Amino acid sequence: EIITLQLGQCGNQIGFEFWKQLCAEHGISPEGIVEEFATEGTDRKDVFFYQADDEHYIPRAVLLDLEPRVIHSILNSPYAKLYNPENIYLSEHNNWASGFSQGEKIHEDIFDIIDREADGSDSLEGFVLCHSIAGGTGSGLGSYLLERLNDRYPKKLVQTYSVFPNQDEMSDVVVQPYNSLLTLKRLTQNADCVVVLDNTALNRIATDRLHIQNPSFSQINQLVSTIMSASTTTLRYPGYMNNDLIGLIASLIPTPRLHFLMTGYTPLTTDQSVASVRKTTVLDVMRRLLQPKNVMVSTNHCYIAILNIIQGEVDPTQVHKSLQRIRERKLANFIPWGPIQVALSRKSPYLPSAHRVSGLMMANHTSISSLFERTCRQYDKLRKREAFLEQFRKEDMFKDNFDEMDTSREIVQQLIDEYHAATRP
Amino acid sequence: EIITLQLGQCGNQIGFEFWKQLCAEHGISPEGIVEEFATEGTDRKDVFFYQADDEHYIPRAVLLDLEPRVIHSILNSPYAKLYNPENIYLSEHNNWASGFSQGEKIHEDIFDIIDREADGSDSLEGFVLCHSIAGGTGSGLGSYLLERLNDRYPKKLVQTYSVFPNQDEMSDVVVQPYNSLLTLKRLTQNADCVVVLDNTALNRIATDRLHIQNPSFSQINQLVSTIMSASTTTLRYPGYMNNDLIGLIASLIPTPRLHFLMTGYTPLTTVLDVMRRLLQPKNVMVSTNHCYIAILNIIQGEVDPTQVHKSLQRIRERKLANFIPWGPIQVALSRKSPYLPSAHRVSGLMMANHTSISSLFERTCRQYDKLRKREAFLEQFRKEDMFKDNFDEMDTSREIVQQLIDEYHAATRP
Amino acid sequence: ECISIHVGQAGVQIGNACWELYCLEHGIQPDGQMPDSFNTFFSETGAGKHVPRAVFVDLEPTVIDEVRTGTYRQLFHPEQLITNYARGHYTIGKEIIDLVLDRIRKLADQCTGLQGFLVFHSFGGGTGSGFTSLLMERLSVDYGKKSKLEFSIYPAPQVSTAVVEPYNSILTTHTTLEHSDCAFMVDNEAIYDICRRNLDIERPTYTNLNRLISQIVSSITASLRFDGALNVDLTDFQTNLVPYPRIHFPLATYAPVISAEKAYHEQLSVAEITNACFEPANQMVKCDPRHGKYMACCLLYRGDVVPKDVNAAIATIKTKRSIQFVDWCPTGFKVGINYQPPTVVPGGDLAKVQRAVCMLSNTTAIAEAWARLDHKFDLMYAKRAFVHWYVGEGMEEGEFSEAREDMAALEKDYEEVGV
Amino acid sequence: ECISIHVGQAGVQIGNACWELYCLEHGIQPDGQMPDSFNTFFSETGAGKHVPRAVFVDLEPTVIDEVRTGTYRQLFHPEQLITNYARGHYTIGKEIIDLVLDRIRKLADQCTGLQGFLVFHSFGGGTGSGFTSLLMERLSVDYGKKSKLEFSIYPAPQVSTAVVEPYNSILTTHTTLEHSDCAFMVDNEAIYDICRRNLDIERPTYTNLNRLISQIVSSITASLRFDGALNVDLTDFQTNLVPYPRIHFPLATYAPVISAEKAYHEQLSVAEITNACFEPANQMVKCDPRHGKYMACCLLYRGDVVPKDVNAAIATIKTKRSIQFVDWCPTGFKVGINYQPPTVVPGGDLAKVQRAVCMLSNTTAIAEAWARLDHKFDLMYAKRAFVHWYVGEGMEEGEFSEAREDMAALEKDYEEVGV
């Protein structure tokens, strides 16, 4: 079993798209009712959904926000009945400190819903927490909830899908530096597995490869939901191999301190058979997904670990010969002092496919330190003259001093230094 | 397998009609579907194609251009859907220096496309390039591609079908001499094999023998594509001998630099008279007892080796040809496609090498010196970084062409 | 769930325009019966009848009386309406301010999710300035932990309606700088110029200007009054734009403005619209933006805008060097989007538009405007002209000295932030 | 992706004619409605409406207003039509240069693939010439490297309203020479003679001259735009016509000028039209190329034309020994062919022709034209008569001396390239 935690309007929209894609994959009616023909579905729908007392099926979802806007919008959406009303919370009525305060102030009901959903789940496997590290709501509240869940559930995994602020442009939120810094500090201290997303690269790929001039929020949500759906599908998709997320992730994490990933997947949202993919082959797809062009992120930096999941017909002999070809060209590189992996998964039996080969890659690259270097520089830039601190002075957590933020800065420094020295034996 | 690198408007068209001819020969629907009658076909297809899950075949071609117009028109043609949109590339927004500067600018995506196409095949042999040498677009872009390809894939043949400008009539580009000289220097530096071409004699033969008084670029380049396809036939159609491009090239190239060619096709009948006709200067499409280097012919349909031997002997006594005094021909055979009508009883195509081609280089070098003596139309060239400081590249290229001409003349003598 | 308050005749007319525009947005008849978003600013009693959280104020009952009899006579609650800076604050304002606060609390307690108050006032009108000072002071004392935003009319550098504008401006600023959380100065002369240049009008009238101002106010409040893929609220406005508590006086702007005839003949390229927002001529205050660095900026789009297009547009604006920021703040945009587009008021000044943006930013040229005001005040203090119109109101020359040195300190702080 | 500019009465009228022709040949209603090719000159709006990339600027409003009240009044975006060389270069045009720059930037920013400018003007109107010089210089300094084509009007050496023409001409020619790309002379005397002799019109109204000149401009520009068996760009035109940075003033030519009735009296041989282009009396400039030599030529065709027939025709015509090139231009030609045929305005004087040609053959007799112009300039400057008008408007006799010396240097360069 597994649960989803959905924070901030970005998290809510991403989760809505995620459930949309999932219910499409499993042939579940938007209301939350299985389709006639799907009665024989072999794939384990119990992983996320579960039978209700009325024979319906509902996602093991959780929505949290301080603004009823997007939640009400969804509740008027065609898929509102998909959710359980009891699994939804709204505030009575942007800064990390404010989010921390609210998280402190509503701990009770939040854990009430969480453990109400957990206890029924016989064999839980972890937590996935999709959100953005820029919104004051998401930042502080997710920080607080991650910390508290770590305190309460030490034997449980936690997964996060962060949405880093754009580096291509002036950050979309003025005080975003502080929010991102604090949230990343908390994530490093507590988070188990991470999936870093930068809206900049999402926008870049959407423009370049989808051939759409205004894809934006809907299409980028399509892409991210597809990524998450592919991962969770290859998990749930029954098979004699790769039947536990813990095992999959452990293959990618030499130590907890390094538990940040780098994503990639062949873009196929638009039908556009002529324009999307004319031909496919495991060799060319694996080659593509190695390039930075297809990644969703913006010193001989190299890789630390790479995993790939493939779908459709595949010839393992072809797979290993392709890997040998890739090694011969030395297109990429692994850690010197170090000693990859690939798995094959099915597809949704009913969902049609406009190809025969596709793949999703997860990588851990030391080049990821660039984002943290940028953020550290930005935060020091803000601290130089100490502006935008008045809001935090209003906050008890920062009413006295700011040692929390300073220690977060030094923790980030240690993390970046460890990443740097990782390549060096 | 093989790749095609067509540049400039000339190259774009060349490719369009070359693929039209290929699709006709292999029974390929304009959309890429395969006809029912060709379902059980035996003709090899990987040579110029790689099928797809939808059963459609995708040309191993990349479209390059500094301007959209031509390719945009192509994509409105009935053959538009056939091409692969990914490979095609159009600049977002006419001098060799500018072309090379852009080539330096857009290295990345171009070789992304090239690598993606290359890795999809196993028995890739070499490269095919179709470009004009006068316009700045084709000239500079081809120069850049050739340089970086030779510096990237040092184990692949590079085959080019250059189109040289008309000479007796005023060349269609005023700045033609610079671009032509630089492109020729690049070809000497890197190009493996070449098939020189000129619009002058090409249209001359098109009007004097094809019996058509209104030949547009369509018909001209259609004939050019015919020459291309007939050159590649046997490679496409496996037989017994000459089952590879390297076999072709080795049969002609005597030395590294001395690798220029001229071509011609007769039925644009007997195996004797056809190859006879392939010898006359009129049929050589291109426009001091200069002589030959190597002679090769390919025949289609029925052929009797007894006929070939007797005819080649008889022509040999007639001594209608000349050979190098200091060194010691070839007649290959192949089969026609099972689709196109055999309106001809037996045909004949020639691709020989002759020392007379030095005359074209002599003309071009004289023109370049003529201009350089008065520094005409150099104002824009200085704009680009490459010629920002000096023009030493021009002098080096001119001297290289002079050395090549000297080598040809020496080869004309023992 | 936020309330609004309007002061001075300027505030009254601006509120009129804002409320009529709103009811057009939600299709509410003058009575208040339509033929969720609606409650965001309106209140529905037991019956379907709706009412806005509106309260005005004015010493002279002419405007209040006419609006009572005005076209929107049947909309507002009869009690919702309420009938020399020192006079505006001390000798007169103190008398009735308590009733105003009574009504304000009676409105607020009814609401549940309160966040702040919208302050609509001027800087020259003595009564308006003084009453606004007293009101916001009392509100802050009693409602400290809540937002408070001014949308005033900074005096134009060249055209002054009255003669004692510096007195009112300096008094209100010295009293309110600490408390006014974030103020949006908007100079009328900018409205004159932009309307003449874009709307193609010959005689600007306060009605048209106030219609435009309400248009900008609707633009800023749209991100609340409707859904959006990138939403925002008052706390964001008063946090992102406050590098320091003292420097919270961002400017205003509304680029897409064209007559119906000019509505066509163009595409409304969002990149072009953003550049227009950043064009110094199109700016909405007579303060050279090119002199001062855009310390902080905020953009609240509405209509059919798209994150990809805004990203490309803002990057294109970035590549232009003519816009420069402070060398210590590399990230200072507060982007904002909303699906709903602006609604053209029938027979109004503007024409139909699909994409609309409302820029807002803080610069340093406002320091130059402050220095101009201070120089005018130096002249006014030189003759000590007609100060006897203030001396008997309970104030003192020491008040003048402290307020003047306060303005000087504010200018010095702006200078520091510049370097 | 090119912008059209115009100056002076001539510029405005040529703009009118050319834009009318483009509308005709794109099947556009007079109001920009169509019941890609046009993409370069005609951008599109949200609805099925396009807008010419036109900018007309003149001191006197008269012509601009008349256009604004003309048949194609609705076509243009209303802001586009913005309203003695010393007068029009120093004290007046300088005070609208900023506004025209603003509009130009607004238009260009819309573009994506800008190539160059098509600036139309005349040496006649002193105001127009001065403003053209100033605007041209400002664009040159502003935009780094983009082509700056010009279709100017070259006054005849005898047939003109010669009163102050030489001074205007010298100043504008100097300023252009400093930073120009290539200006295409045209003379009303030549147009008059051509239409009288060939097209048989007795009183050629200025609009008819504009019609023919517009058809020439179409034959060049639409060929630049329309795809064809052999296309071309603007930078190609700049590089293939300028043997040296100073000698970039080719003449004009156009073969088919037959009226309707005699349009059936010929088979329209490509060789015949090419010869007519090389026929000295069919050129649109007062000069004898027999004295000079053809540096380089560019040949543009449209309609049913075949490259091989073109080659045969050019070979036959040049084989005529009368044509005398220079001994260092073995390759001085460029051809251009477009699928689309020429278009004729209904009721227009010209007759429909399946073919068409427009040649820009740089020659050297223009050197003699410059020589006579400079001689007449010196003669008029000897007395200095009617010059204080220049003197008081921001110029001095030093400027006259400087321009005289510069044009003498240019003439010396012409003589050099003549040997």
Ligand SMILES: Nc1nc2c(ncn2[C@@H]2O[C@H](COP(=O)(O)OP(=O)(O)OP(=O)(O)O)[C@@H](O)[C@H]2O)c(=O)[nH]1
């Ligand atoms: N832009 C604009 N400014 C207005 C409008 N109505 C009034 N004003 C300005 O607002 C200010 C008036 O301030 P109030 O406080 O409204 O004036 P009062 O209430 O008459 O003030 P006292 O005379 O001091 O009692 C002056 O600057 C007017 O020019 C309007 O419709 N539009």
Ligand SMILES: Nc1nc2c(ncn2[C@@H]2O[C@H](COP(=O)(O)OP(=O)(O)OP(=O)(O)O)[C@@H](O)[C@H]2O)c(=O)[nH]1
């Ligand atoms: N091609 C063309 N040129 C014209 C036409 N009518 C006038 N001209 C030319 O335009 C010149 C007038 O100068 P413009 O620059 O056109 O007029 P302006 O700019 O209003 O004139 P000033 O204010 O006196 O400088 C005359 O000298 C003619 O040579 C016409 O119909 N066609």
Ligand SMILES: Nc1nc2c(ncn2[C@@H]2O[C@H](COP(=O)(O)OP(=O)(O)O)[C@@H](O)[C@H]2O)c(=O)[nH]1
């Ligand atoms: N991935 C994604 N990010 C978004 C989307 N909309 C806004 N954002 C980004 O997420 C952050 C906004 O955070 P939000 O959740 O809106 O903040 P809150 O006010 O704290 O809830 C900024 O970085 C926005 O750029 C969206 O649809 N998808």
Ligand SMILES: Nc1nc2c(ncn2[C@@H]2O[C@H](COP(=O)(O)OP(=O)(O)O)[C@@H](O)[C@H]2O)c(=O)[nH]1
């Ligand atoms: N034979 C032939 N040559 C062509 C054709 N199209 C263009 N060319 C040649 O290509 C050159 C024109 O320059 P190109 O590089 O093609 O033009 P750009 O791409 O506009 O710079 C000249 O040599 C033309 O003769 C065509 O259809 N046939």
Ligand SMILES: [Mg+2]
């Ligand atoms: Mg008053």
Ligand SMILES: [Mg+2]
């Ligand atoms: Mg004039």
